[PDB]
Amino acid sequence: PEEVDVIVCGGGPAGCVVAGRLAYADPTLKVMLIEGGANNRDDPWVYRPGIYVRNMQRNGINDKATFYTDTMASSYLRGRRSIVPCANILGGGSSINFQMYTRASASDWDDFKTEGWTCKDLLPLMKRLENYQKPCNNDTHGYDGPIAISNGGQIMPVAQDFLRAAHAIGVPYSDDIQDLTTAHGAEIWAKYINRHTGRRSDAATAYVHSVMDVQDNLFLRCNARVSRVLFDDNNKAVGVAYVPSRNRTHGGKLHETIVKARKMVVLSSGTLGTPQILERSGVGNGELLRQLGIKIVSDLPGVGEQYQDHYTTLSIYRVSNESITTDDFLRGVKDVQRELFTEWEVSPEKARLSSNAIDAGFKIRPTEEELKEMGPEFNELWNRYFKDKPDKPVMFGSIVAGAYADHTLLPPGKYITMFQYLEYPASRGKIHIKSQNPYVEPFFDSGFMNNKADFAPIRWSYKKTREVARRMDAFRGELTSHHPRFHPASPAACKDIDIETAKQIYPDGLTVGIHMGSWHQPSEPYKHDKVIEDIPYTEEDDKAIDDWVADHVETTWHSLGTCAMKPREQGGVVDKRLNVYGTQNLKCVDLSICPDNLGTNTYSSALLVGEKGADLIAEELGLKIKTPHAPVPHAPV
Amino acid sequence: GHPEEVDVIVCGGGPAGCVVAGRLAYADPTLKVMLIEGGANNRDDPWVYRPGIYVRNMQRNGINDKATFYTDTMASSYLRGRRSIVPCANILGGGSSINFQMYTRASASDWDDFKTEGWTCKDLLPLMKRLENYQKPCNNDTHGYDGPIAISNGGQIMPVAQDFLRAAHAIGVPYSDDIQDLTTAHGAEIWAKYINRHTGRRSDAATAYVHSVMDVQDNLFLRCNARVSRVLFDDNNKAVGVAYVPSRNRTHGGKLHETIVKARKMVVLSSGTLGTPQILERSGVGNGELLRQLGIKIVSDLPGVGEQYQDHYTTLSIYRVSNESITTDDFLRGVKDVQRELFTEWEVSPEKARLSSNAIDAGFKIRPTEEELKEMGPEFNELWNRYFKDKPDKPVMFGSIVAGAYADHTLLPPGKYITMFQYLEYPASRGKIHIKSQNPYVEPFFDSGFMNNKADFAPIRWSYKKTREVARRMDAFRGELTSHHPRFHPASPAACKDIDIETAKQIYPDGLTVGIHMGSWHQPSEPYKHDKVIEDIPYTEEDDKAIDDWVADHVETTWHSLGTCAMKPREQGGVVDKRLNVYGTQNLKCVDLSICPDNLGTNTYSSALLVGEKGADLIAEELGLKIKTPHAPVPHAPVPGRPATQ
Ligand SMILES: Cc1cc2nc3c(=O)[nH]c(=O)nc-3n(C[C@H](O)[C@H](O)[C@H](O)COP(=O)(O)OP(=O)(O)OC[C@H]3O[C@@H](n4cnc5c(N)ncnc54)[C@H](O)[C@@H]3O)c2cc1C
Ligand SMILES: Cc1cc2nc3c(=O)[nH]c(=O)nc-3n(C[C@H](O)[C@H](O)[C@H](O)COP(=O)(O)OP(=O)(O)OC[C@H]3O[C@@H](n4cnc5c(N)ncnc54)[C@H](O)[C@@H]3O)c2cc1C
After folding, report:
1. Quick one: A415 and A549 in the same domain?
2. Calpha distance A102→A421 (Å, rounded)
3. Shared domain check, A394 and A366
4. Does residue A248 sit at the B interface (CB-CB below 8 Å)?
5. Quick one: B57 and B188 in the same domain?
6. How far is B34 from chain A (nearest CA, A)?
7. Cα–Cα distance between B95 and B57 in angstroms, integer?
8. What is the dihedral sign for C-alpha B69, B73, B78, B82?
9. Is B609 known as a binding-site position?
10. If you count Cβ atoms within 10 Å of the first and of the last residue's Cβ in chain B, which end, N or C, has fewer?
């Protein structure tokens, strides 16, 4: 058509819930979901979980991601221009992400300090979205929601190996680290995978294609980049203008098509996308819009400010050749890939590919002792933010059964990577547009490590995750190339592959065991007997780690906080009901609205914001949300 | 044994024929009905029920026997001296056993324009829903959900589909959830298939209407491999039965081996646009001068028997694509382990399998602007005013991306391809088919009649340019296949650009021959740049004339034959009643697409079924039978009666 009731802009977790719930709640209500990227419906490069890694390739084929590079270099990162991707496909992150089922701790929601948003307030909505298909010992999960959650088809022998090691350095085992209370414990790590079908638990098939298969009131435009919201003379959002995904017209001319809104315009276009739409619509910092030739609808300085992410570091460790890992599949060995593709088709329920291979991990929190060696600047964050907040973790740590790094830069053999990220950083960034044009790259700043308090925890994490690695059965060495630049004589210096493992990789190789060049100090072969003591570290080694953090820290795609929800005088952008200040009929509901960070992989969060926004809109339209939701394609119920 | 007498005899087991015999046999288990089909039985044959191998059925290779080839008796000045080949189906299920399985529906006005009571759109709307089991989302209530024939997006949509839509948006053809809503003249969709979403099997009419009934009742008789010669008549021109001969003429002395089977109540003719007129003519029902010259005793003088042969007119614009693109070419080539990988996939999981598609996964119906109408000349403008002007639901051209070449790969270079499959919705040009002898094995006179009306050139020309602009904007695009494109002057800015160097080297990394200019046989395209600004190919009068030549050289049938036994009054050369009775006879109907008095803007499987549904209703009431809903459950399908997921 040209006109409908609710327009949802962006087809991410949040957007898919809003559009899907409202369209099901009332079949009269015409809602249209507009998404920049492509439709994901029945795409074997979405619904199969194991091929997740490739959606982060800058290979000029991958069209499922937009890559946001920093405008200028950062001193704090020793001169590098940070890259932050995000989804360009229906589903958003849910079509391309690691599928790690994590949840925030309880206090995180209370620290929003906003009525409607306590843990207490959201707990029932949390249960409403979840389809929990694994055991636990608490009452904290839901069992008839759309989003299937499990340990997946098969757990890799390294998972329990990681756990055995975590126990040995005094992290306790728990059945569920996602019970809203835990900050220091270790688990088998669940996925957004259906235990029964082997399929990825995307938001689009759960909430949108579910509804489109049974009713005719839900409209979908994919390959459609929403330029701006259309405004009234009294600032009521009337409609929405989108352009084609490609800029491939005659003479590169703009081609806007307009769609009009009777009731609501919803901005679910992501932490990076949403502030851009608001800013080119005329809703942002007044100084910026003036210069850009944009008439001011509302003057909001915090639009596109306070960029919060999680700060990833990837410690990589060499493992035994008998170890089962993803590396040969990731390199694209032919009949490795044929085997796992065939195994998934025949038996999704036991298939290796029905997993993300991130099968174990922990949330961690430092000791009275450990806090002494983490510097003054972090201790000030601790006393203020953490000290009397026992349910908040400081670092995340998981085991990927394979290298998560360009294998074109990795030696042969088997790897595991320790996937770490900083939970509540103090650093902050920003994103502003440089034009009315919706094809120009915007100004961008990661803001990674611009606060000094963020080094001490990551450094701590490096030494900790390493003490685990060294205590595992599968461990053979540290990939020197991808590790800190310790001094060769420091006791903390790396030790690379041992000779027995090397010889196994190239049994007829002429180069194995040639000392010439002294490029590594090899490990002594594996002894199951070996007694192990913690690696000592000097102030020198601690500089080396910091330097390593500044050169190799990255985004975790856990982007939030650019349209913050807090009072307008503080800088915030939305009401408690997520209305953009000084407009009518306009709400921003996605991770943009977070005023404060969460201790979690953020698919659970984006969904929960999406459930809450559906509640708020539904009681504003006098509509009642159905439970359960429409039956979800390819699922037994 | 088999019966020597029954109630109703349906001659020809196509879509229409299958609806009739099925609906009636299910409507009364006492009613004895015999379906006689010239082709072979299609039941549980993996070269029918797998949608992915459809291409093979048009091979003229000495092996394939699921098609009869009718060639023009005389060269056509209009095609530049070439004799035109039109195949039709030679198998139970007719075209529904061997076609592209593209789900398309006529526009509302097409039916209205028959100008015959009982055949209005709103008259036929319930019968349209009665036959469908629609297995995809759409934002309308135009479809049915408990009919026999399953319709879906198939197992796996190709990445080039959504790419094609992006390019079609870039040139102002709008996206829509459903272009088959009897309403749309201008728009682009993901194109559905006559393929059962859950089983991944071909939704042919024989299994859906006939085999279903034969499983649960004893009163439906099937006689395959039986060419219907002629209709036996009474002294009062009542049809009293039918005589058939073997499919293969391989008897002692090359002799005529006729078996007779009598009909108590009705003889139905459903042998297709090409078949039915011949059966009528060699029975004594057609042009009197022709029948008097051939020594056939005249039953009914109908000059319009085998006149007004219409069709849709196809052109195939072939383009080269990136080597990382997913296409069908290697599978069509017969690369052993590509075939092996795809046959295995469909066996294990038909619900997601690439073979559960036709690979024709996106397209558009298109209508020109006033802007574009000026380009198209006086003889197409006279047609527009006369036919399309105040008929806003009628499209001029159809267009769909095939994810591969639809052409002899023996004549194609290596690499990967896509074709813009294009056809003319409502041609002005008309053809004819008449028999040459009483013998049912001699070839008839034939005349495609393609392009014998100059009005047809201009819209196809406009299609070439329009689909070419769509090609040029795609992510997968790597050039035109010069060899299979119009003969532009090489200095023209409309001249073809063939494969670029980077894509070429990928084809043959260790080839000694890649990059040799010598011969200058192709103007290479410059390598793919994601950023590239594109501008439309400009054309001249000379370029236009090149394309008109290309159209005359390379235009073909779309297998959408209709119109040989037109339903209109006898004094205007019509052949049948508004109840599809053959003028001058009793207890004889035609129910197949031969009856259509005017074209329909659609892939005609939908329309052939609808005429069968209508024919069943007409015969039912004549016999006082009520048609049962839903029909007998369909082999290999699951138990369904409203919109659902999978
Ligand atoms: C590679 C990756 C790995 C991750 N790892 C994990 C993990 O292990 N576990 C976990 O639970 N979560 C993970 N996440 C985090 C989580 O998926 C995201 O935080 C979540 O998807 C946020 O949802 P959103 O709707 O707020 O934004 P998004 O998911 O990014 O969705 C935004 C959507 O809006 C569209 N859009 C942008 N601009 C426009 C426009 N102008 N018009 C129309 N549409 C537009 C985009 O195309 C996109 O589809 C990860 C994310 C990614 C990308
Ligand atoms: C290769 C191909 C591609 C096509 N593409 C599409 C598409 O993508 N989508 C779509 O919707 N439609 C398509 N069509 C068109 C569609 O299949 C036909 O319009 C439809 O099958 C016509 O049905 P019918 O009953 O009118 O005649 P037919 O389907 O031709 O059936 C006639 C039957 O009569 C039999 N017969 C003929 N003469 C005699 C005789 N003397 N005695 C006994 N039996 C006889 C034949 O064996 C045949 O089985 C295509 C057809 C073909 C062949």
Report:
1. yes
2. 13
3. yes
4. yes
5. no
6. 40
7. 10
8. positive
9. no
10. N
Residue A425's nearest CA partner among A402, A399, A453 is A453
Look-up: residue for tokens 């630049």?
Answer: A485
Instruction: Answer whether B641 touches A (CB < 8 Å).
Output: no
Q: Tell whether A459 and A332 lie within a shared domain.
A: yes
For tokens 């392009």, what's the residue?
A: B451
Calpha distance B221→B33 (Å, rounded): 6
Q: Hey, which residues does A186 pair with through a beta bridge?
A: A173, A362
| A60 neighbourhood in chain B, CB within 8 Å | 530
Q: Phi/psi of residue A43, each to 5°?
A: -110, 110
In this structure, the answer to whether residues B356 and B430 fall within a common structural domain is yes
- Evaluated on CA atoms B630, B632, B635, B636, the torsion sign reads positive
Determine the Cα angle at A103 with ends A99 and A108, to 5°. Answer: 140
Q: Which residue in B139, B156, B158, B469 has the most chain A C-beta atoms within 10 A of its own C-beta, making it the best mutation to test that interface?
A: B139
Please, which experimental method was used? X-ray
CB of B162 within 8 Å of a chain A CB? The answer is yes
CB-CB under 8 Å, B137 with A634: no
Last residue of a domain, one of B537, B560, B583: B560
Residue count (chain A) = 637
Nearest to A214 among B140, B171, B645 (CB): B645
Q: What is the 3-state secondary structure (H, E, C) of B159-222?
A: HHHHHHHHHHHHCCCCECCCCCCCCCCCEEEECCECECCCCCCECCHHHHHHHHHHHHCCCEEE
| A628 prior amide bond cis, ω within 30 | yes
Structure tokens at B298: 């005249």
Q: Total domain count for chain A?
A: 2
Show residues of chain A in contact with B533, CB under 8 Å. Answer: 247, 251-252
3-class DSSP state for residue A416?
A: strand
- The verdict on A251 and A400 lying in the same domain is no
| 3-state SS, residue B56 | helix
The Cα B294–Cα B438 span in angstroms is 7
Q: Which domain holds residue A381?
A: 155-190+308-558
Measured in angstroms, the CA of A2 and the nearest CA of chain B are apart by 12
Beta-bridged to residue A224, according to DSSP, are A244
Tokens of A434: 């440089």
Q: Which residues pair with B260 in a beta bridge?
A: B243
Name the residue among B625, B622, B617, B619 with its Cα closest to residue B29: B625
**A215 and A351 both lie in a single domain:** no
Closest C-alpha among B400, B402, B397 to residue B366: B397
- Whole-angstrom distance, CA of residue A268 vs CA of residue A81: 27
- 3-state class (DSSP) for residue B344: helix
Closest CA to B285 of B589, B609, B583, B639: B583
Secondary structure letter of residue B460 according to DSSP = H
This PDB structure is determined at a resolution in Å of 2.6
> Which residues on neighbouring strands pair with residue A555, listed in sequence order?
A311
